[PDB]
Amino acid sequence: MKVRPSVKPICEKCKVIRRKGKVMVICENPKHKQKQG
Amino acid sequence: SRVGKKLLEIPSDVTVTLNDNNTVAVKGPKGELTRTFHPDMEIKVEDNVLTVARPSDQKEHRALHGTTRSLLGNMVEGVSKGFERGLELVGVGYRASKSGNKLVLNVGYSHPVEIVPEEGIEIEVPSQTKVVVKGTDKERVGAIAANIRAVRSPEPYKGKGIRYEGEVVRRKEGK
Amino acid sequence: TTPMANASTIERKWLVVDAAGKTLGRLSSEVAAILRGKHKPTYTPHVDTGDHVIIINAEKIELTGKKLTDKIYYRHTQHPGGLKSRTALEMRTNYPEKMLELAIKGMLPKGSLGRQMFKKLNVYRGSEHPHEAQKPEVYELRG
Amino acid sequence: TKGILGRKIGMTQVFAENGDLIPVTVIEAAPNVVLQKKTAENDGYEAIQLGFDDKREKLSNKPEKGHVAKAETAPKRFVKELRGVEMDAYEVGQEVKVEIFSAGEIVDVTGVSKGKGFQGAIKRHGQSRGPMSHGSRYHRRPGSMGPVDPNRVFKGKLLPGRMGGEQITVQNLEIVKVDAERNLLLIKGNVPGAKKSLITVKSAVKS
RNA sequence: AUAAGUGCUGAAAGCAUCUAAGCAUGAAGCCCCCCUCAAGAUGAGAUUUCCCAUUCCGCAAGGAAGUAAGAUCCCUGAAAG
RNA sequence: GGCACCUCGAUGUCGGCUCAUCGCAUCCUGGGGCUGUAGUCGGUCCCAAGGGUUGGGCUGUUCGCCCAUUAAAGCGGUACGCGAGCUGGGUUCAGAACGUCGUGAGACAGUUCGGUCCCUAUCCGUCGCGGGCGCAGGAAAUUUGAGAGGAGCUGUCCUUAG
Ligand SMILES: [K+]
Ligand SMILES: [K+]
Ligand SMILES: [K+]
Ligand SMILES: [K+]
Ligand SMILES: [K+]
């Protein structure tokens, strides 16, 4: 996980979503997994 | 909701009964499934075609419409054809064995892991390296398959573990 | 010239309020008013002019928003770090009578008379109450 | 749950078959009797009330006479409930005897701990002394009453007072030996309270 | 029962998606379980057993007086202080 | 540090002792994601404050370094918590001395040796222990548990298995 104020697509296959009112990236690359915090 | 609006053909062998409070019971050759839906949705059955209707184009309704349609479709498919989920044990000495109704997994722990299936779910072990979870309810088939996968989820260094059939496990190089 | 109610003049009816499907606050504000006796023209500030209230179906009280999970009933035990908490959900399931009582208690006056007014509240989990002898009338919430 | 009441005779010791030396306590328990059976109907919980120890008819009163009348026994000096017991395996009047227990059986054992009277925060609260030397005028006082900020002492500042005479339960003691011609148990270890003091033995809660 | 986390099924958004509806799992932590106190819990709870409806004024209200069951004073003491 | 708002008809000041309590920005232990994670070890971030979190040498010290441990040797707040609880080594009275400055008396965040720490607890608070009345008759026992307190740590070895 990256938990960070700035959450963004790193690659092209990054996909910003929203779960539980929290901005997350998801991406086949598990490095790129983001949550916003 | 393209999904919601799509029309659901009921096969001749499946009877859908609409009960009070939007409770749909779906009966077919493989058994019966009962489920309550949200009141706002309008589920019609005309000439062996199930259609779902949303009261308004509010965010919630557009979402509910597609969901309801999808769930009813899964119920009809479930009682007719059934759902199966297939698992592949990858590993030296990794073996599944059915003991009565219990699935027993030997996956490199110091003890065997027993899984008891819930009602309506059959686990088959066609080979020592393959497990097939069968059932009517797509959710429950999925849940049990995930539970079995959880015992030893696939690792990236040699792909060892329990995987779904046709799962692309990401691989990293060790030494 | 202004008349004043006193123990000799006051006469208290018994009212049953069904809490089923009612908003916690909105029920509680009304009940508190009846307990104080704000609905009677003989209302006198320095005496308890109000009516008894039975609440039934306290377990079926409703909360809007995410208040079931998020509304927390704190309490302190007056020992250091003695702060306990229960969620509204936990209150409603296990302590429904306490939940209503707490809500109403906070809406009454606070001194000796206000404590006295609270004694006429009787709250119950299920549909039945044991106060058949008091011959309680139904009271619909004005809303 | 099995239970019985008893008096603490006092300790002694017992070689085991292996030859190991076992310290025991000697709980004389001349048969307990059942006096009441509480139920979920009546009392709102299921229990049995045991009586122990024949009281003299001088030392009794009409309310103690009256209460034992159903069981049909003499007034009992000690009366203690047991909850959790299997209700249908007793009857009011039934005697409860040490042979309910077995050797090697685990037990919990209650008593009232031996009283000390008023005690210092050293003994009472196992607190450290101050220095005894080095110009110290602080030997056995109980420490600082706490921070300034609150302008009050924090409830649970531990202080000298009356010590001992608490209900205490020790757990998971062995029954070493049962004697029913004497009405004794032998219990590996040391249980709360004086000699003659009332000891309750139960089956252990954590088995 | 939850946290982080992992999900299942699943649309909004023909796909995907742990979430919107719905359904799981999951911490030495939370609530219990264990130990102790506890009805001044004035919201003063419950159960068992005992005593039993006395004599006076006073129009009654009420007050006074002997007692019942029971307890105490005083006394012998300690396992208590 | 700045400011000079309370206290100069007095709010005792460092360190230690005794007694703790709180925060979490977590030192250990519990649960996780990512890893330039093979394993054993680690790194980093997330949840988690329940409990735990050492004995010495030197120095008035705090701090720090060192020795030996430990699962760990957390960081902070509480009048840099705690002197009507203790100490009084240091700082900060009067003596004396060194270096230094000063014509001098003297002086020095320079040093050195020596140098009085008062108080019978009224109230609240804390810890124990009684007496009173209450609890719609008077009693003797046994109780339910609203509620409150306590406890909460962790090593090593063997086996699984070389
Ligand atoms: K001053
Ligand atoms: K200060
Ligand atoms: K002092
Ligand atoms: K002071
Ligand atoms: K005061």
Swiss-Prot record, chain A:
GO terms for biological process: translation. The keyword Electron transport does not apply. Pfam families: Ribosomal_L36. It comes from the Bacteria. GO terms for cellular component: cytoplasm; ribonucleoprotein complex; ribosome. InterPro entries: Ribosomal_bL36, Ribosomal_bL36_sp. One of its GO terms (molecular function) is structural constituent of ribosome. Transmembrane segments: none annotated. PROSITE patterns: RIBOSOMAL_L36 (PS00828). Keywords: Ribonucleoprotein, Ribosomal protein. Part of the 50S ribosomal subunit. NCBIfam families: rpmJ_bact (TIGR01022). Belongs to the bacterial ribosomal protein bL36 family. This is Large ribosomal subunit protein bL36. The lineage of its organism: Bacteria, Bacillati, Bacillota, Bacilli, Bacillales. The gene is rpmJ.
UniProtKB/Swiss-Prot annotation, chain B:
GO terms for molecular function: rRNA binding; structural constituent of ribosome. The keyword Ligase does not apply. InterPro entries: Ribosomal_uL6-like, Ribosomal_uL6-like_a/b-dom_sf, Ribosomal_uL6_a/b-dom, Ribosomal_uL6_bac-type, Ribosomal_uL6_CS. This is Large ribosomal subunit protein uL6. Belongs to the universal ribosomal protein uL6 family. Keywords: Ribonucleoprotein, Ribosomal protein, RNA-binding, rRNA-binding. Part of the 50S ribosomal subunit. The lineage of its organism: Bacteria, Bacillati, Bacillota, Bacilli, Bacillales. The gene is rplF. This protein binds to the 23S rRNA, and is important in its secondary structure. It is located near the subunit interface in the base of the L7/L12 stalk, and near the tRNA binding site of the peptidyltransferase center. It holds the Pfam family Ribosomal_L6. GO terms for cellular component: cytosolic large ribosomal subunit. GO terms for biological process: cytoplasmic translation. NCBIfam families: L6_bact (TIGR03654).
UniProtKB/Swiss-Prot annotation, chain C:
GO terms for biological process: negative regulation of translation; translation. PROSITE patterns: RIBOSOMAL_L13 (PS00783). Signal peptide: none annotated. It comes from the Bacteria. Keywords: Ribonucleoprotein, Ribosomal protein. The keyword Mitochondrion does not apply. One of its GO terms (molecular function) is mRNA binding. Disulfide bonds: none annotated. GO terms for cellular component: cytosolic large ribosomal subunit; ribosome. Transmembrane segments: none annotated. Part of the 50S ribosomal subunit. Binds to Obg (AC P20964). Belongs to the universal ribosomal protein uL13 family. This protein is one of the early assembly proteins of the 50S ribosomal subunit, although it is not seen to bind rRNA by itself. It is important during the early stages of 50S assembly. This is Large ribosomal subunit protein uL13. The gene is rplM.
UniProtKB/Swiss-Prot annotation, chain D:
Residues 121-151 are annotated as: Disordered. InterPro entries: Ribosomal_uL3, Ribosomal_uL3_bac/org-type, Ribosomal_uL3_CS, Transl_B-barrel_sf. It holds the Pfam family Ribosomal_L3. It comes from the Bacteria. Disulfide bonds: none annotated. One of its GO terms (cellular component) is cytosolic large ribosomal subunit. One of its GO terms (biological process) is rRNA processing. Keywords: Ribonucleoprotein, Ribosomal protein, RNA-binding, rRNA processing, rRNA-binding. One of its GO terms (molecular function) is structural constituent of ribosome. One of the primary rRNA binding proteins, it binds directly near the 3'-end of the 23S rRNA, where it nucleates assembly of the 50S subunit. Strongly stimulates 23S rRNA precursor processing by mini-ribonuclease 3 (MrnC); 20-30% DMSO can replace L3, suggesting the protein may alter rRNA conformation. Belongs to the universal ribosomal protein uL3 family. Part of the 50S ribosomal subunit. Forms a cluster with proteins L14 and L19. Interacts with RNA helicase CshA. This is Large ribosomal subunit protein uL3. It comes from Bacillus subtilis (strain 168). The gene is rplC.
